[PDB]
Design a binder for this molecule. Structure first.
Ligand SMILES: Nc1ncnc2c1ncn2[C@@H]1O[C@H](C[C@@H](N)CC[C@H](N)C(=O)O)[C@@H](O)[C@H]1O
Ligand SMILES: Nc1ncnc2c1ncn2[C@@H]1O[C@H](C[C@@H](N)CC[C@H](N)C(=O)O)[C@@H](O)[C@H]1O
Lengths: 344, 344
């Protein structure tokens, strides 16, 4: 028993760490230039937060962030990695002649032993919609190793949500589902499953990007301060919203993105996944409503987005929304574990 | 516990049956017109093999093949399905007014109880390169329920292999692996992992289609007779080959496809996934050599393809090949579980 094993189905964990054991998957993240370059910038431009310091890298993967901490002058970097990627990180530490400074520790951060407390924790634990993968909890957990007044890079995370209109995306779900609305598919009446098919498609958050013109109101922001938050704070995430509609139209759902800030002694550096910013491997995420809501400019769209952590390293998403002026309401349940990857 | 649980890692099984629980995935198979239409043809044109007979459908999914057995006049059809798709099949059986003839039985065919021995077993248990998923073993296992001189649909399966030349494919995989040849990726020397990266990328069989002109020799055929084979026969599959090269050039690997035959009392019907035939959702599969072999027209390319079943419902593929005239040899290990889907 650890904190990780207690919150995670073994079958989910096996698949998860298998995925990250692939060099190709580490490469995918590494080649996201906005991601990798911003981390390097955050670390190097805040060199005083690393110079002669003790560092923990939570989920080091290839080791890339630990190498940046080394470039910034860290004395010692504990690089923790639970997948078989830990073996490859070790190879790189030796080939880059950094054995005196980067120590790879294979295992889950919730299960390993560190020899000493650290000045600063670095990690890239963000998933889709920020919270997917539940690795933010591992990052917060790692604070048991943090010296008092130690730092976290990133320091804070902001989730943004905004209502969108996208009639073509909405309609696409019914078109797919209507495969089932055939009374004689090779002589078989499939129609009884059409509703189940619709339900299945609407349960998948949509991962892709979009034009900012689809957004119908200024975003609402939910902030997690990684210096102050406890792991338990991420088990149930309640995001109330009150959108003041800037455009009239049919609201088909809520769009999500996230930013993180590295609040260093020299400067604050932001990594944004917003649709106004260059694209990242996180794209953006949209959660559809099964019934859209009509709203006019100046109306208020109010409700709650409730994210409930599950044992498959993800979240059950519940979105309830109403147009206050008409009482028209929509209620939606989504499975963040299994998004629809729409981008092309 | 059961023959299934003994040969299968739980984490693999969970993911596998989750996949097939999706209506979208059942739809993907159902909409393969060559697949679904050829099954219907095989069954209906051999109506005497079904008329007033008892049938087992191994892995019924939506129920579609059981409906075809019903159309052909079967008295009773036991439709076994281990995913939650079984519940959707039940719905269709009721909505098609076939409750008197199709009996859905939720569970693994190696764990359920059938009330009764059967005249004929129908299944679509073919994966990529025929053997992926190890469902052919469940199909063979189901023969414990088959009456003496009962039939199997499909009855036999042929795997074809042929050498191919495709420099562009080769270079694409090598280009991706060569990400890890860089001496200064954001200042970090990745080159110590280049060999491991080549191994990983070359370990992935390539799923897509191709022009038949890339083939350098007539195919070699390996046949599995489903009437006679035992599940244990699929644990280690040894396919010797001796290709008489028709064209001179660089051999970049072996291409694989498969056919199955439904040997009925009225006629034999073939389902082919060959690159000479209309495309199916199985496409074709190519196993690259890390280093290509030069051969001249008239040379012999000889060796063995060895498929060793693993607990992740797939196979470790070993391909050893040599050009007899020069002694040039290539030895390759591939992981059929995790193919590169290139057609997308
Ligand atoms: N609980 C955990 N303990 C240790 N490592 C973990 C844990 N959870 C996730 N990881 C690893 O964290 C890494 C997360 C990656 N997104 C980041 C890799 C790398 N730090 C990079 O920035 O490129 C993966 O390699 C996971 O295997
Ligand atoms: N051991 C097993 N016991 C019961 N069902 C299985 C087993 N292995 C695989 N399956 C199911 O077999 C089905 C395989 C599909 N290729 C076929 C579905 C359907 N018969 C069709 O032809 O459309 C999936 O629905 C799996 O969930």
């Amino acid at each position: 028993r650890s904190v990780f094993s207690e919150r995670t189905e073994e079958s989910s964990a096996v698949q998860y760490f298998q995925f990250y054991g692939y060099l190709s998957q580490q490469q995918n993240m590494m080649q996201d230039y906005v991601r990798t370059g911003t981390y390097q910038r955050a670390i190097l431009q805040n060199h005083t937060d690393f110079k002669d310091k003790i560092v923990l890298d939570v989920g080091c993967g290839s080791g890339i962030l630990s190498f940046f901490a080394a470039q910034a002058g860290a004395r010692k970097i504990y690089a923790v990695e639970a997948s078989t990627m830990a073996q490859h990180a070790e190879v790189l530490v030796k080939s880059n002649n950094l054995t005196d400074r980067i120590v790879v520790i294979p295992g889950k951060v919730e299960e390993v032993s560190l020899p000493e407390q650290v000045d600063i924790i670095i990690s890239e634990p963000m998933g889709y919609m920020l919270f997917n993968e539940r690795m933010l909890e591992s990052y917060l957990h790692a604070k048991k190793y943090l010296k008092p007044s130690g730092n976290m890079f990133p320091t804070i995370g902001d989730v943004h949500l905004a209502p969108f209109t996208d009639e073509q995306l909405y309609m696409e779900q019914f078109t797919k589902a209507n495969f089932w609305y055939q009374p004689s598919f090779h002589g078989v009446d499939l129609s009884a499953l059409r509703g189940a098919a619709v339900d299945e498609y609407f349960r998948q958050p949509v991962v892709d990007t979009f034009d900012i013109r689809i957004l119908m109101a200024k975003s609402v922001k939910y902030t997690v301060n990684f210096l102050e938050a406890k792991e338990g704070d991420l088990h149930r995430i309640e995001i109330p919203f009150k959108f003041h509609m800037l455009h009239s139209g049919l609201v088909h759902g809520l769009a999500f993105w996230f930013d993180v800030a590295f609040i260093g002694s020299i400067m604050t550096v932001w990594l944004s996944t917003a649709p106004t910013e260059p694209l990242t491997h996180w794209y953006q995420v949209r959660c559809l409503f099964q019934s859209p809501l009509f709203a006019k400019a100046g109306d208020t769209l109010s409700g709650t987005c409730l994210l409930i952590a599950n044992k498959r390293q993800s979240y059950d998403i519940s979105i309830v929304a109403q147009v206050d002026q008409t009482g028209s309401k929509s209620s939606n349940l989504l499975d963040l574990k299994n998004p629809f990857f729409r981008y092309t």
